[PDB]
Amino acid sequence: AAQTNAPWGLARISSTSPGTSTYYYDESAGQGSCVYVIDTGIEASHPEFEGRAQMVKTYYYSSRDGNGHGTHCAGTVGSRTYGVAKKTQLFGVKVLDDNGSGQYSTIIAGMDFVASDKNNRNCPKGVVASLSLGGGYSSSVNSAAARLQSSGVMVAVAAGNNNADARNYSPASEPSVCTVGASDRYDRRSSFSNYGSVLDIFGPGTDILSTWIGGSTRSISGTSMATPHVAGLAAYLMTLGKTTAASACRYIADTANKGDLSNIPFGTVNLLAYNNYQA
Ligand SMILES: COC(=O)c1ccc(C[NH3+])cc1
Known part of the structure; x- marks a missing residue:
């Protein structure tokens, strides 16, 4: 399938070159997979989600996204126009x-919730969790992300926006999850993106158009925006049967566009997420 005039990040993930605007992907589109977006919530009523999004848990007085951040990330995972995996089921x-x-x-x-809750959902092609959040190093936070991954969920986490080594941030620093840095439309490391040995992959993170609350759209930047590109890609590849939750991060790294990003510090992987879809 071909989506013309796609957001640059979608075009980038299906391209061997920057500077194109059509997103190419297998029509299976993540059907039969599920992606949990662990964040501020999801405005499931947004027409862009087509009834495929729902809130499953909140720890606050409402499950509504009163912020927008979670809705934006969910849109990059799976919205019809702004999403990588346009037929996945989204759980907020x-x-x-x-x-x-x-x-x-x-x-x-919330992480332990997802590890159990997936057993209450129909996700025959596999389960992904997207964590566009983080703070300072915490062994307990890292351990929770490791448990979620161990339970059979492909965990993608933001590297963080400190322009620093991600070793000092959690869950970014957990080795067993997929830690995602951010790039821009010119294949430069995003100016805010953390780096370091713990990063597994880069995805589009600067000026990313997606869904927003109030049935709207907007473009924002962060490793929070790169993470759902990778989570959606994992769901897409799992539906295709090309990888599993346990191996999806390594598979994405192995099949990435290699050596194409600029301003990647020595010792950080130079790998950009790529679907290898041949139309
Ligand atoms: C230190 O000057 C740079 O910004 C820089 C230029 C090119 C590369 C190789 N991709 C890395 C870094």
Whole structure:
């Protein structure tokens, strides 16, 4: 399938070159997979989700996304226009309040929730979790992400936006999950993207158009925006039968566009997420 005039990041993930605007992907489109978006919530009523999004858990007085961040990330995973995996099922877990903040104890509970809740969902092609959040190093946060991954969920986490080594941030620093840095439309490392040995992959993260609350759209930047590109890609590849939750990060790294990004510090992988779809 070909989506013309796609957001640059979608075009980038199906291209061997920057500077194109059509997204090419297998029509299976993540059908039969599920992606949990662990964030500020999801505005499931947005027409862009086509009834494929739902809130499954909140730790606050509402499950609604009063912020927008979670809706934007969910849109990059799976919205009809802005999403990588246009037929996946999206499950929202609201661990962050409407200001975008959340206690680590709530975030940990949300991860353990997903590890169990997937057994209440129909995801025959596999389960992914997208975590566009983080803070300072915490062994407990890292352990929760490791448990979620161990339980059979492909966990993708943001590297962070500190222009620093991700070793000092969690869950970015957990080795067993997929830690995602951000790039721009010119194949440069995003100016804010963390780096370091713990990164597994880069995805589009600067000026990413997606869904927003109030039935709207907007373009924002962050490793929060790169992470759902990788989560959606994992769901797409799992539906194709090319990889599994346990191996999807390594598969994405192995099949990535290699050596094409600029301003990647020595010791950080130079790997850009790529679907290898041959139309
Ligand atoms: C240190 O000057 C740079 O910004 C830089 C230029 C090219 C590369 C190789 N991709 C890495 C870094």
